[PDB]
Amino acid sequence: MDALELLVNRRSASRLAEPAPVGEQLQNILRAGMRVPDHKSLQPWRFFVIEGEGRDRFSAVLEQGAVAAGGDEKAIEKARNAPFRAPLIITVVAKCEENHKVPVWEQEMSAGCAVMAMQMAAIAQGFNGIWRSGALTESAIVREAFECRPQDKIVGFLYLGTPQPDPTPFVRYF
Amino acid sequence: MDALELLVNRRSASRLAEPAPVGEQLQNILRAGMRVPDHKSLQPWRFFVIEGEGRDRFSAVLEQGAVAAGGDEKAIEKARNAPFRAPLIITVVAKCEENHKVPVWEQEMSAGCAVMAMQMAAIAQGFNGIWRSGALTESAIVREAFECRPQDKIVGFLYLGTPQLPDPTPFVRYF
Ligand SMILES: Cc1cc2nc3c(=O)[nH]c(=O)nc-3n(C[C@H](O)[C@H](O)[C@H](O)COP(=O)(O)O)c2cc1C
Numbered sequence: 205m206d207a208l209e210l211l212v213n214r215r216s217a218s219r220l221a222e223p224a225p226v227g228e229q230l231q232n233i234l235r236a237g238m239r240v241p242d243h244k245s246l247q248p249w250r251f252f253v254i255e256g257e258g259r260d261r262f263s264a265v266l267e268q269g270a271v272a273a274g275g276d277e278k279a280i281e282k283a284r285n286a287p288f289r290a291p292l293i294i295t296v297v298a299k300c301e302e303n304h305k306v307p308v309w310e311q312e313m314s315a316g317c318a319v320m321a322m323q324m325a326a327i328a329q330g331f332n333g334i335w336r337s338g339a340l341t342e343s344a345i346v347r348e349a350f351e352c353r354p355q356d357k358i359v360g361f362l363y364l365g366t367p368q369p370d371p372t373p374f375v376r377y378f
Numbered sequence: 379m380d381a382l383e384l385l386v387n388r389r390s391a392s393r394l395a396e397p398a399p400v401g402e403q404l405q406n407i408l409r410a411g412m413r414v415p416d417h418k419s420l421q422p423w424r425f426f427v428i429e430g431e432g433r434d435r436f437s438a439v440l441e442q443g444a445v446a447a448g449g450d451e452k453a454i455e456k457a458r459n460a461p462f463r464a465p466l467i468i469t470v471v472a473k474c475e476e477n478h479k480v481p482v483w484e485q486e487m488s489a490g491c492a493v494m495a496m497q498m499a500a501i502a503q504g505f506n507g508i509w510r511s512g513a514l515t516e517s518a519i520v521r522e523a524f525e526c527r528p529q530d531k532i533v534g535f536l537y538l539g540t541p542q543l544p545d546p547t548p549f550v551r552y553f
């Protein structure tokens with residue numbers, strides 16, 4: 205599709221089904237992720253592809269995180285069933301350098317932009333998805349599953365697959 | 379311009395000159411910024427357009443912030459001359475809601491995405507730019523000029539104008 209048309213009319217999709225992006229479609233999404241702005245070229249991200257048996261392993265981690273977080277019966281099954289809302293999930297970890305000339309927040313911004321860049325690359329190839337987070341991004345069990353050091357941060361669970369403009373209020377002139 | 383090719387080949391440009399995007403070109407850039415992901419639709423951003431005489435006002439604000447930060451002569455003059463590296467600057471402020479169900483970091487993330495989306499909208503229309511920050515985003519004088527409350531944050535100075543002028547293996551893991 206047209207670049208300007210996507211940038212002006214980008215919409216997410218939460219109801220996702222097969223097929224997911226695979227092969228060069230998935231490779232293009234990951235290429236878009238690593239092309240985001242990056243102060244001093246630190247490349248401060250890791251992209252965890254979750255599909256197939258990885259989806260069930262992700263499900264068991266989210267379930268174990270919701271139990272440790274003190275969820276009720278509703279919350280644990282929702283957490284267990286959360287990964288099954290898409291054929292593909294990409295988890296983006298901000299892999300940050302501490303006490304760097306670049307503050308941590310700028311490196312986190314780069315990782316967050318990678319999430320939107322990947323969702324846009326999904327839409328451009330005829331797919332879609334939704335950037336999700338929730339309280340489980342802070343779960344100690346989920347973080348250790350994604351190899352989060354203290355300075356690292358889970359910025360998004362990007363669900364992906366096949367789905368089923370007046371800026372005046374925000375603009376000021378300096 | 380093809381959407382996927384822009385996303386895969388995106389590059390910034392620091393050498394920027396007139397013309398700046400104006401009219402519907404500028405409006406299209408601002409439309410892209412307001413279309414970013416936004417948890418619970420808080421719209422937590424403000425876009426400050428800096429052009430013309432505004433560039434001089436931005437120059438004086440940055441110079442004031444450099445003085446108050448203890449910069450030397452070189453750093454103060456560099457701050458004063460910083461806005462004149464492009465015909466257009468859009469400063470993005472994360473306008474955050476505290477003690478909301480949506481954590482502040484998710485709202486700040488939305489405002490940062492707005493910078494990149496606007497930069498891509500510049501590229502799509504034949505312009506380009508560079509997302510900049512530096513220590514002066516934390517300056518008390520600079521923050522006040524951009525009406526920052528304590529919970530607000532300057533996430534970028536997006537310089538824009540007419541430019542003059544991938545292997546994901548190490549970062550991808552399979553869960
Ligand atoms: C939050 C953020 C702040 C940045 N601040 C600066 C900056 O102050 N100065 C700078 O040269 N680059 C800064 N960058 C990086 C540039 O925007 C740009 O990504 C870099 O020059 C690499 O060029 P490229 O985008 O073409 O890959 C920043 C990036 C991010 C995400």
Ligand SMILES: Cc1cc2nc3c(=O)[nH]c(=O)nc-3n(C[C@H](O)[C@H](O)[C@H](O)COP(=O)(O)O)c2cc1C
Nearest residue numbers: 215216334335336337338415416417418484487488
């Ligand atoms: C950092 C971040 C985290 C988000 N987390 C969630 C989430 O956990 N659940 C959700 O429904 N939407 C979340 N969103 C918002 C969605 O990504 C999406 O923008 C929203 O559903 C509106 O869809 P739209 O992009 O078409 O406007 C988040 C957005 C951001 C920027």
